[PDB]
Symmetry: C3
Subunit: 137 residues, 3 copies
């Protein structure tokens, strides 16, 4: 494993709303829950910014995280991400927030504590470009 610092920004996290955790030993992603005080209505085509109540600090520049829709919410309810895929840089230390976009024709309710996205830690490579007149092998 790799250690990632997490700062709890809302006292509900770790009490009434669990920290993110891997469901199984074989899970690639961590479900991300929303930290809100009352149910949030998401109308068809609406985008709403939803706080998680946590911040992470990846720190290692060879690692990033991506935030993806949940498969069931996306397929069944059209509850996806307004920016489609979120990218979390190694030096990002702000609260994780979810751009929740309803692409469906049905109104949707997000309840406090609901899982609405997933977080996946991936290795990344920082490239150095070499400007060339023609590509070579």
């Amino acid at each position: 494993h790799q250690v990632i610092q997490l700062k709890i920004l809302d006292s509900r996290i770790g009490d009434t709303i669990p920290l993110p955790a891997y469901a199984t030993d074989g899970s690639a992603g961590l479900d991300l829950r929303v930290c809100i005080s009352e149910p949030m209505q998401v109308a068809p085509q609406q985008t709403v910014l939803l706080p998680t109540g946590i911040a992470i600090y990846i720190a290692d520049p060879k690692l990033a995280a991506v935030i993806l829709p949940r498969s069931g919410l996306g397929h069944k309810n059209g509850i996806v991400l307004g920016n489609l895929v979120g990218l979390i840089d190694s030096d990002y230390q702000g609260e994780l927030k979810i751009s929740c976009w309803n692409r469906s024709q049905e109104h949707f309710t997000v309840n406090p504590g609901d899982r609405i996205a997933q977080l996946v830690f991936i290795p990344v490579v920082q490239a150095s470009f070499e400007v060339v007149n023609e590509f070579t092998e």
Copy 2:
């Protein structure tokens, strides 16, 4: 390379519908074909769940797969994924199914055997969180 077990769930696979395979030695992804008996109409804004007739077993918890739209279908026809990006965990052993979403204003026909998404195997990192009051270096 890395060995990934594949189970054929539909006898058409490997006969009339090819197994997924890399197009070139430099390909990052594998096109995923649909295993259906007749053409499937996908109306504007419709989401349909399309079977592939295969299951995979990645097994290695340091590896995952993502399922992405094809670039031409997505750009030209608006034929993309209802959950935008699929994430396949290392311990997932069910049939691969595609959430096919038509985001365009044009009706689209999916024929038996058509490639409609691509599969990419990526390394993933399982993080262990350290809850901190303030981030440190």
Copy 3:
């Protein structure tokens, strides 16, 4: 770091429109700018193909790149990608082009040189399948 060849296809690149570069030492992605001669209107639901004026040659088959929406453009303006996520293979040598899709209900102007997507280099694994009757450990 890893060296990636870049070919400049439009003389504006490196003069009036900067090469892609990492914003900070901890950045996972590189913003991609559009190489056009006049502002481009993107109507609600419209998809337009936007050139970058550069081509890259990753070459290493253990590496790929993905093209993602920018978080602010996607969340605030609904300016995302028509194929949702672009995948750049290691052997792709053509111009990088952005499928720019306006998923919002508001008209949007893309100016010459604007950043409208981001590029992330990721390791990829080329799998070899083993067709099995049942999965094993």
